[PDB]
Amino acid sequence: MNPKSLTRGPRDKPTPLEELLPHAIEFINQYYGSFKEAKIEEHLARLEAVTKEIETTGTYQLTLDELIFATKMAWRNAPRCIGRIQWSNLQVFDARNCSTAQEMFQHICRHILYATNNGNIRSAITVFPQRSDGKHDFRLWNSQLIRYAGYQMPDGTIRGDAATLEFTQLCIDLGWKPRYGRFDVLPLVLQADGQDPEVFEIPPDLVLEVTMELGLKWYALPAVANMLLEVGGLEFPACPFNGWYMGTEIGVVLHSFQKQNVTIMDHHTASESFMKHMQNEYVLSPFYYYQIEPWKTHIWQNEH
Ligand code: HEM
Ligand SMILES: COc1ccc(CCNC(=O)C[C@@H]2CN(c3cc(C)nc(-n4ccnc4)n3)CCN2C(=O)C(C)C)cc1
């Protein structure tokens, strides 16, 4: 067998033009091929523009329409995503002009607000600046936009999310005030332009939770924070996205989500979202890759 790696690692230098150009050309072909018989002359013109931009600047910028197409095709190309059947239902937020961590935080607040929609969940992706030389990466160090902290007990058992024990310690190490509950929402840890990450508490009013029906509960919004979007040889190492829950196992239910009017992929929702998708009809690439946990690769500039 010849599987590919599902992981795309860091770089220390810009992608070589000899490697970048063929990938860009192939993506430009995929995009204009989505029109099939139209736009031959526009296709060729974009090819020339992209090629001269790469030759002059070492890289290129996607148009907004190309970016939107890319995020949706990468979604379509996600092997295990059940949601991908309605891939046209995706809202894109273009944050490619973002420069600071504070600005990242505001983009993410907007994303969480839009996607949560008081429970009527909408799928969205926010795209931060593409990798340049690999020394100025944007990254969310979180695995999810919303997730509970995990604390190790003296007996070896975990309080909270057992899967986040390491990340939770990192937050504490970064100065995050360690509460000790079973449902403490982790802070956003945000890296801008390759700098050391900064810690931002998520405004509590932005976190919608479903109370189970006892003591249990969970967050309504499943958002993956840590993957990298690849398209036309370009890499976007910060591109958080969300859908809604499957419900078959959230980790804490099907009644409680439905009761509090929080979207899950039940039969009604499956049918309606596919219906909405269908109405929009009026090496895989692009692709979402996993990355190496950034605290394992980051070179600390301040380390205080
Ligand atoms: C609208 C609701 C959505 C639902 C119900 C949904 C559901 C799922 C489920 C059940 C998984 C599989 C987990 C596993 O078995 O490993 C998954 C994986 C994934 N989803 Fe979604 N998803 C949705 C939206 C999205 C969106 C909006 C994107 C991105 C634009 C997306 C990208 C992915 C990716 C990249 C994976 C991992 C794929 C892999 O590793 O094979 N999903 N999703
Ligand atoms: C909303 O869809 C679901 C996502 C996660 C779950 C729980 C199962 N958990 C996982 O699969 C763990 C992670 C996180 N994971 C998540 C987690 C969250 C909160 N959300 C998503 N997701 C949202 C939209 N698409 C995917 N995906 C992706 C799959 N994961 C992997 O480790 C694969 C590499 C095997 C149920 C439904």
Swiss-Prot record:
Chain residues that bind heme b: C81, Y290
Localization, UniProt: Cytoplasm, Cytosol
Residue pairs linked by disulfide bridges in the UniProt entry: none
Signal peptide extent: none
Family from the record: Belongs to the NOS family.
Record function comment: Produces nitric oxide (NO) which is a messenger molecule with diverse functions throughout the body. In macrophages, NO mediates tumoricidal and bactericidal actions. Also has nitrosylase activity and mediates cysteine S-nitrosylation of cytoplasmic target proteins such PTGS2/COX2. As component of the iNOS-S100A8/9 transnitrosylase complex involved in the selective inflammatory stimulus-dependent S-nitrosylation of GAPDH implicated in regulation of the GAIT complex activity and probably multiple targets including ANXA5, EZR, MSN and VIM.
Oligomer status and interactors: Homodimer. Interacts with NHERF1. Interacts with GAPDH. Interacts with S100A8 and S100A9 to form the iNOS-S100A8/9 transnitrosylase complex. Interacts with SPSB1, SPSB2 and SPSB4. Interacts with ELOC and CUL5 in the presence of SPSB1 or SPSB2 or SPSB4. Forms a complex with ASL, ASS1 and HSP90AA1; the complex regulates cell-autonomous L-arginine synthesis and citrulline recycling while channeling extracellular L-arginine to nitric oxide synthesis pathway.
Protein name: Nitric oxide synthase, inducible
Organism: Mus musculus (Mouse)
